[PDB]
Amino acid sequence: GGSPRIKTRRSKPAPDGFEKIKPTLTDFEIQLRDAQKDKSSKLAAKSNEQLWEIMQLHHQRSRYIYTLYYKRKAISKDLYDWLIKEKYADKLLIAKWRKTGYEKLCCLRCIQKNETNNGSTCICRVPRAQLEEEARKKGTQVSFHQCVHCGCRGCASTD
Numbered sequence: 001g002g003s004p005r006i007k008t009r010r011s012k013p014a015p016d017g018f019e020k021i022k023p024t025l026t027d028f029e030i031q032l033r034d035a036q037k038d039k040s041s042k043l044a045a046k047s048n049e050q051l052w053e054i055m056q057l058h059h060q061r062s063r064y065i066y067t068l069y070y071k072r073k074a075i076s077k078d079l080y081d082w083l084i085k086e087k088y089a090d091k092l093l094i095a096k097w098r099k100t101g102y103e104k105l106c107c108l109r110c111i112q113k114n115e116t117n118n119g120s121t122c123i124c125r126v127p128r129a130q131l132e133e134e135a136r137k138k139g140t141q142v143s144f145h146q147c148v149h150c151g152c153r154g155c156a157s158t159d
C-alpha cells in the first residue's frame, strides 16, 4: 500500500460490554459500503432504492440495541447511552414507536408536521383518504404509493 487508511471521530471510550456487540455493528459498514459505493461508482439506474437500503439499515441498528437493552437486558445504560451518542441506534425513533399512535412509522424526518410557520412532513405519513381530500379541494386528482425519502410504501396510522 504506502499510506494508512483510517478516519473516525470519537469522544469517550466504550466499556468492555461493547465487545459483546463489536463485530455485529462492523457488519453494517459492509452493507452500507455497497449502497455508499454506488453513490460514487456506477450511478445510472436504481439510485433512490440504494439510499433507502442505507436509511433502512438504521432500523436494524435500533432493533439490535433495543432487543439487547430492552429485552435481553445484557448491557448497561452507560454502553447503551455511549452507542446512542457515538452513532449506533436512535432514541427519538425508539421513542416515537413507544409513544401512542405511532403504529405506521418508517423514519424520524418522514412523519412530522408543524402548525406555527411552515409544514415539514412526508407524504407517506398521510394516508390515501387524507390525500384524496386534497384533490377534491383543488378540483384535481391524486395517487401516491411510496415516498422518495426512503423505501416506504405509504405508511399511515390514523387511517
Ligand SMILES: [Zn+2]
Pocket (backbone or CB within 6 Å): 106, 107, 110, 124, 149, 150, 151, 152
Ligand atoms: Zn420513511
Ligand SMILES: [Zn+2]
Pocket (backbone or CB within 6 Å): 110, 111, 122, 123, 124, 125, 147, 148, 149, 150, 152
Ligand atoms: Zn416518507
Ligand SMILES: [Zn+2]
Pocket (backbone or CB within 6 Å): 105, 106, 107, 110, 124, 125, 152, 153, 154, 155
Ligand atoms: Zn413512511
